[PDB]
Amino acid sequence: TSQVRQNYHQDSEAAINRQINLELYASYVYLSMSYYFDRDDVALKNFAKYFLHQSHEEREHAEKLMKLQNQRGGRIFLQDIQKPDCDDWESGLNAMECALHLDKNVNQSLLELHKLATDKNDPHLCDFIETHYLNEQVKAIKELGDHVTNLRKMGAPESGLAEYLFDKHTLG
Amino acid sequence: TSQVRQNYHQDSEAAINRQINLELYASYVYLSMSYYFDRDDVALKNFAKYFLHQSHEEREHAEKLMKLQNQRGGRIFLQDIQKPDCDDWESGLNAMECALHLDKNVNQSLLELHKLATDKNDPHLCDFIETHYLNEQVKAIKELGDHVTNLRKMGAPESGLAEYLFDKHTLG
Amino acid sequence: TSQVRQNYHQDSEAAINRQINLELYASYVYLSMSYYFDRDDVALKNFAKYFLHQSHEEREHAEKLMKLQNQRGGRIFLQDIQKPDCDDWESGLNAMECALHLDKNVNQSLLELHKLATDKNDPHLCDFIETHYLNEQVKAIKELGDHVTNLRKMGAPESGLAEYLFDKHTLG
Amino acid sequence: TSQVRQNYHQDSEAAINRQINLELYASYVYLSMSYYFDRDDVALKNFAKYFLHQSHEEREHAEKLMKLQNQRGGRIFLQDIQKPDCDDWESGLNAMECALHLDKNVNQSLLELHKLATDKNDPHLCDFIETHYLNEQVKAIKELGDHVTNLRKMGAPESGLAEYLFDKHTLG
Amino acid sequence: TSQVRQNYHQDSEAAINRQINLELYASYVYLSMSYYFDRDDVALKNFAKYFLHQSHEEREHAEKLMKLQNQRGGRIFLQDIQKPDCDDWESGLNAMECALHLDKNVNQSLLELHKLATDKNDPHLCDFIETHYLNEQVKAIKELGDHVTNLRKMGAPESGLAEYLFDKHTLG
Amino acid sequence: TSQVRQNYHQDSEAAINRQINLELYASYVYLSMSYYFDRDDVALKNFAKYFLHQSHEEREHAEKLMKLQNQRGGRIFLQDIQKPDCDDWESGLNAMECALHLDKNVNQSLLELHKLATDKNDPHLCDFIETHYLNEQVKAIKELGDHVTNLRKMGAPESGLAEYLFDKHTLG
Ligand SMILES: [Ca+2]
Ligand SMILES: [Ca+2]
Ligand SMILES: [Zn+2]
Ligand SMILES: [Zn+2]
Ligand SMILES: [Zn+2]
Ligand SMILES: [Zn+2]
Ligand SMILES: [Zn+2]
Ligand SMILES: [Zn+2]
Ligand SMILES: [Zn+2]
Ligand SMILES: [Zn+2]
Ligand SMILES: [Zn+2]
Ligand SMILES: [Zn+2]
Ligand SMILES: [Zn+2]
Ligand SMILES: [Zn+2]
Ligand SMILES: [Zn+2]
Ligand SMILES: [Zn+2]
Ligand SMILES: [Zn+2]
Ligand SMILES: [Zn+2]
Ligand SMILES: [Zn+2]
Ligand SMILES: [Zn+2]
Ligand SMILES: [Zn+2]
Ligand SMILES: [Zn+2]
Ligand SMILES: [Zn+2]
Ligand SMILES: [Zn+2]
Ligand SMILES: [Zn+2]
Ligand SMILES: [Zn+2]
Ligand SMILES: [Zn+2]
Ligand SMILES: [Zn+2]
Ligand SMILES: [Zn+2]
Ligand SMILES: [Zn+2]
Ligand SMILES: [Zn+2]
Ligand SMILES: [Zn+2]
Ligand SMILES: [Zn+2]
Ligand SMILES: [Zn+2]
Ligand SMILES: [Zn+2]
Ligand SMILES: [Zn+2]
Ligand SMILES: [Zn+2]
Ligand SMILES: [Zn+2]
Ligand SMILES: [Zn+2]
Structure with a gap:
């Protein structure tokens, strides 16, 4: 036991270690999504920049x-960062939908941590x-829902015009 | 009777009190419309900002x-501000149409006051x-008609593309 | 149910809608109080500016x-904004006392929401x-109590000298 | 009972009065430690400045x-500030260890207040x-543990070289 | 005996330790007085700021x-800081009178040290x-007498108008 | 086959995908090492910042x-990022030695890619x-060897003085 450890349950320490993994995982999902949109046969540069920014934030x-784990005297135990479920994200709309589902899953986990x-x-x-997690998670979820x-409404994903225009006018 | 009251008919004092209520009401309609467009399932941020600005102006x-009531020595009598007729404003086009109808109603009342x-x-x-009401009301009515x-012409409300593009290019 | 809704009870959604109304109501009370002090037979311009600022804040x-309602995927339902209990607020001291009672009522409601x-x-x-409500409400309540x-202590409301000097030296 | 008092238990008012005393006490401990290191036969000026800064913060x-007590309508009741347990703090390491133990004691009390x-x-x-106490207390505890x-690891307290170098390179 | 100690009587070392306590005590009295005037039922913010500044100076x-004790090779021995005689200071005038009596007591002690x-x-x-104590003590005593x-003369303490105006015009 | 693909062997595409994983892995090793040195019982902040910077670079x-994969018309296939071999890195010297061994392993892989x-x-x-990999890898390897x-030579790891001074004077 750490000299600084006070009021810090073993279960909370473990929950923080699981949340760390889940944030790294979300970072990895967003990185995959980013470079999907950087493909020559997708080519939506602001979708790509958007998800790259989300990847860095995660x-x-x-x-x-x-x-925080170290501040409280817990011990960091890292786990593999699992590859995302998809290599090919299909469309702007589908990636935004997947992001929204991902962010609601991270939020649920954060609510359980709370x-x-x-x-x-x-x-x-x-x-x-x-302070640092619940409201940002709510704002991200709201933004992703706004995008979906x-x-x-613009006719995505069938309309490649729709995704192209959203890439320019919202994500640009 | 106020020490400052001069040439100020009882009927005019009452008409000003009714116009005050009607302006607060218009403010409330525009506020409702603003946050309708801020919903995750509507998500037109410039429509939202546009109507929020109109709400503040009202x-x-x-x-x-x-x-003015106090300048003339009249006595302010406030009334309930009625909730708007709608909670759900349907579309950008419908809200603009409702705004136009609202603003022509406020104008009619202002003409009667005159x-x-x-x-x-x-x-x-x-x-x-x-000076302060009739021309601004005419400009607002003209602007709202321009928007409708x-x-x-862009295909609203069936075209969610149309509303999305108008939100960016006119209201942005 | 909203695509963004997560961990958001029906009862909380309704409580937020009641708090929205109560904030609009407080805004209306302060607006009424503001223009009471703008009357030629009251004429306390800093009391008027003070309450106008509170009205805008509400x-x-x-x-x-x-x-917040929209961020969480709740649905905004607006209600009439009731006219204040008084048209005539009597004095600086009485209006400050009414404001203090109003702000403790809004706080109680905010505590119940919590x-x-x-x-x-x-x-x-x-x-x-x-973060956004409880401490500001406590500071406002403290400030209003300080003013009352x-x-x-200055001899308000019998001393119109007292209110005049407080208007200049505290509210100015 | 104060005109501003709302939702403020007698027990909480008393707990705040005990925490006030405990903060003044910590301030006094750090002041004592500060001037210990200002002695000609100790002479560690950055240890002295470090603890003087902590004393002021407390x-x-x-x-x-x-x-906060006054904001909530509680009544401040002050108690003697007890002299620290030591007049002579022995070494840089021992003072940092005592500070760490002090800060964990203040934290425990703050947790009980919560x-x-x-x-x-x-x-x-x-x-x-x-907002104002728990995280700062955690950061201070972490910093003090880092220092200890x-x-x-540098060989304090036997190595007066170690304390001298830490005074320059960490506390300077 | 310190390597730096020269011409420094044991009795002087002890007198300095008693004066240190007395300065901390005065600091504590002024802090208590400060937050008395910060109460919602006293509410004199410049009296509060004034005494807070005096508390910091002490x-x-x-x-x-x-x-100075350490410069001369004396050894600092700290004692409890006694709580002030009053929790409730009654009025602006009474607190200023108490401050004046306190400052003349500190001065007497400083004269005895001399x-x-x-x-x-x-x-x-x-x-x-x-250089550092006697003239500042004389100026503080003169200022406090000026205030009393x-x-x-303004009619304090019966006139709460008087204290309110003095708070604004002298202490502001 | 991509419209942009030219002179890009299937084996090279696969080698790039393996190198991507290996860079993410190195990033993860350095992140783990970074927060090891941020522990309260290690507390070497410049070692921590140093490895955090390396983690970001990887x-x-x-x-x-x-x-590059997308520029050439290859398809990105991501794999799990394996957790580092150690949770506890022992000392500054041992972490630098592990980093050096890691960076020579990444280099070998880069040489095989070439x-x-x-x-x-x-x-x-x-x-x-x-241009972008071999020389930077050589400079990093040289720097890590310089540090080891x-x-x-300073007596690490037995001398915690040595690591503390290196943290300040080289990594600071
Ligand atoms: Ca909080
Ligand atoms: Ca002299
Ligand atoms: Zn990057
Ligand atoms: Zn996250
Ligand atoms: Zn796997
Ligand atoms: Zn996220
Ligand atoms: Zn909680
Ligand atoms: Zn909570
Ligand atoms: Zn606004
Ligand atoms: Zn209008
Ligand atoms: Zn109604
Ligand atoms: Zn209008
Ligand atoms: Zn006319
Ligand atoms: Zn005319
Ligand atoms: Zn206004
Ligand atoms: Zn409010
Ligand atoms: Zn009504
Ligand atoms: Zn309020
Ligand atoms: Zn709570
Ligand atoms: Zn809480
Ligand atoms: Zn100081
Ligand atoms: Zn503290
Ligand atoms: Zn004692
Ligand atoms: Zn502390
Ligand atoms: Zn709590
Ligand atoms: Zn809590
Ligand atoms: Zn050095
Ligand atoms: Zn202070
Ligand atoms: Zn003094
Ligand atoms: Zn005592
Ligand atoms: Zn003094
Ligand atoms: Zn002399
Ligand atoms: Zn002399
Ligand atoms: Zn980072
Ligand atoms: Zn690399
Ligand atoms: Zn594994
Ligand atoms: Zn590398
Ligand atoms: Zn080559
Ligand atoms: Zn070549």
Whole structure:
């Protein structure tokens, strides 16, 4: 036991390690999606830049959780970062839909981490999750839903015109 | 009777109080319309910003009428601000059409206030309505008609492409 | 059900809609109080500016709750904004006392919204209420109590000298 | 009972008064430690400046809790500030170890204040403790542990070379 | 005995330790007085800021005496800082009167420290007390007497108008 | 087959996909090493920053290879990123030694990619590997060897003084 460890349940330490993996995984999904749109037969550069930015943000969230684990005197245990479910993401709309589903899955996990923070009477961890994770996750989910809606209303994915215009006018 | 009251008919005082309510009401309609377009399943951010700006302008018109009531020595009597007729505004085109109908209704009321100013030989009130209300109301009505026309010519509301492009290129 | 809705109880959605109305109502009370002090037979311009600023802040709080409702995938349902209880606010001291009572009522409602957030295990909503509402409400309540106390210690409301000097030296 | 008091348990008011004392006490410990290192026979000026800065920060935390007590309508009751346990702090390493133990004791007390905030359904107090106290306390504890570790790894306290170099390279 | 100790009587070392405590005590009195005026039922913000500034100055005087003790090779021995005599300071005038009585008590003690400096033929200590303490103490005493006089001439404490105006026009 | 694919062997496409994985893996090793040194019981902040910078650089090298794969009309196939061999890196010296061994392994793989570029008469790929990878890999290897040597000459790992001073004077 760390000299700094105080009020930090073994279960919370483990939950943080699982969330770190999940953030790295989301980072990897977004990186895959980014370079899918960089393919010559897809060629949507702002979709590509958009998901590359999300990939970097996720990796930074993983790092912030690593920082928190060490601040509390927990021990970081890293796991493999699983390859994404898809190599080929089909369309702008489908990738945005997958991103939305991914981000709701990460949120659910973050909500479970918070419930555990409650259960274990760990208000530091509760504020950490609340301040740095829950609202950003809600804003990202809202933004991704906004994007899915526009793309669908614009006629994506059948309309490659729709995705091209959304790439320029929303993601540019 | 106020120490400042001069040439200010009881009927005009009451008409100003009704116009104040009507401006607050228009402010409320535009606020409702604004956040309709901020929904994740509508997601037209410039329609949302556009109507939020109109909402603020109406509230400021209400305040200017309150100022005028007190300048003339009338007494402000406020009434409930009725909720808008719709919670769901359907489309960009429909909201613009509703706004146009709303603004022509506010104008009619302002014209009636002016007729009453004439009837009561109140040139201060007549100039107030003329300078600060009638031309702005005419410009807003013209702008809203311009918008309705474009949206219709672009294929709105069936074309969600049309509303999306109008949101970017006119309201952005 | 919204594509973005996650961990958002029906009861919380409804509580947010009631809080939106209550913020618009507070905005309306402060607007009424503002223009009361703008009357020629009251004539306290800094009391008027003070309450006009509070009116604008409340309206902005309503808007932020509307934003939150949409972020979480709830549906905004607006209600009439009731006219304030008074048309005539009597004095600086009485208006400040009414404001203090109003702000403690809004706070109670916000505390109930937070209890419901707890009950429903909704930490996003809990942080929202905590970060953006509870402390500002506490600071406003403290400021209003500070004002009521000074006015009373200065001899308000019997002393119109007291209100005049407080208008200049505190609210100016 | 204060005109501003709302949702503020007698037990919470008393807990805040105990935390105020504990912050003033920590301020006093750090001040004592500061001037120990300013002695001619110790002479570690950056250890001295470091603890003087911590002393000032604690006093500022006490003041912020006093502010909070008054904001909520509680009544401040001050107690003697006890002299620190030691007049002579032995070494850089020992003072850092004592500081770490002190800061974990203050944290435990802050965690108990938060539990009480939970028990009493006082979310304003809960956010106050969370935002302004719990994370700063965690960062300070982490920093102090980092320092203790370096000093020990460097051969402190037997090595006066170690403390001298740490004073220059970490605390300078 | 310190390698730097020269011409420094045991009695002077002890007198400095008693003066350090007395400065910390004055700091504590002024802090208590400060937050008394920050109460919602007192609400004199410039009285509060005024005494907070005095509290900080006293603490800095304590620190300067600690510095001097170490410069001369004396050993700092800290004692409890006693809680102030009052929790409730009654009025602006009464707090200023208490401050004046406090500052004359600190001065008397400083004069006794100087007499002892004379008795012990310690001109360094004599100049220290003279340059850094005696004139500042005289100016503070004069300022506090000036304040007490104005407040009394203005009708304080019965006139809460008087304290309110003095707070704005002298302490602001 | 891509419309842009020219002179790009199936074996080279696959080799690029293996190198992408290996760069992501190196990024992960360096991230693990970074947060090891951020632990309270290790506490070498410049070792931590150093390896965090290397982690970011590797991830950027992976991204540049993804870019190249798409430029040539190859198809990106991502694989799991394996967790590093160690959770606990022991010391500054040991981590630097592991980094050096890692970087020589990545280099060997890059040399094999280049041999394959030669074998397949792919001069674009050969220049890519040469310009953007081989010299940077050589400089990194040289720098890591320089670090290992200093740490060993300084008495690391037995001397925690040595690692502490190297952290300040070389990595700071
Ligand atoms: Ca919070
Ligand atoms: Ca002199
Ligand atoms: Zn994330
Ligand atoms: Zn990073
Ligand atoms: Zn796998
Ligand atoms: Zn995310
Ligand atoms: Zn919490
Ligand atoms: Zn929580
Ligand atoms: Zn209008
Ligand atoms: Zn306004
Ligand atoms: Zn109605
Ligand atoms: Zn209008
Ligand atoms: Zn006219
Ligand atoms: Zn006319
Ligand atoms: Zn509000
Ligand atoms: Zn607004
Ligand atoms: Zn009504
Ligand atoms: Zn309010
Ligand atoms: Zn919470
Ligand atoms: Zn809560
Ligand atoms: Zn503290
Ligand atoms: Zn301070
Ligand atoms: Zn004691
Ligand atoms: Zn502390
Ligand atoms: Zn809470
Ligand atoms: Zn809490
Ligand atoms: Zn050095
Ligand atoms: Zn003093
Ligand atoms: Zn100081
Ligand atoms: Zn005592
Ligand atoms: Zn003094
Ligand atoms: Zn002398
Ligand atoms: Zn002398
Ligand atoms: Zn590399
Ligand atoms: Zn990148
Ligand atoms: Zn594995
Ligand atoms: Zn490398
Ligand atoms: Zn070549
Ligand atoms: Zn070659």
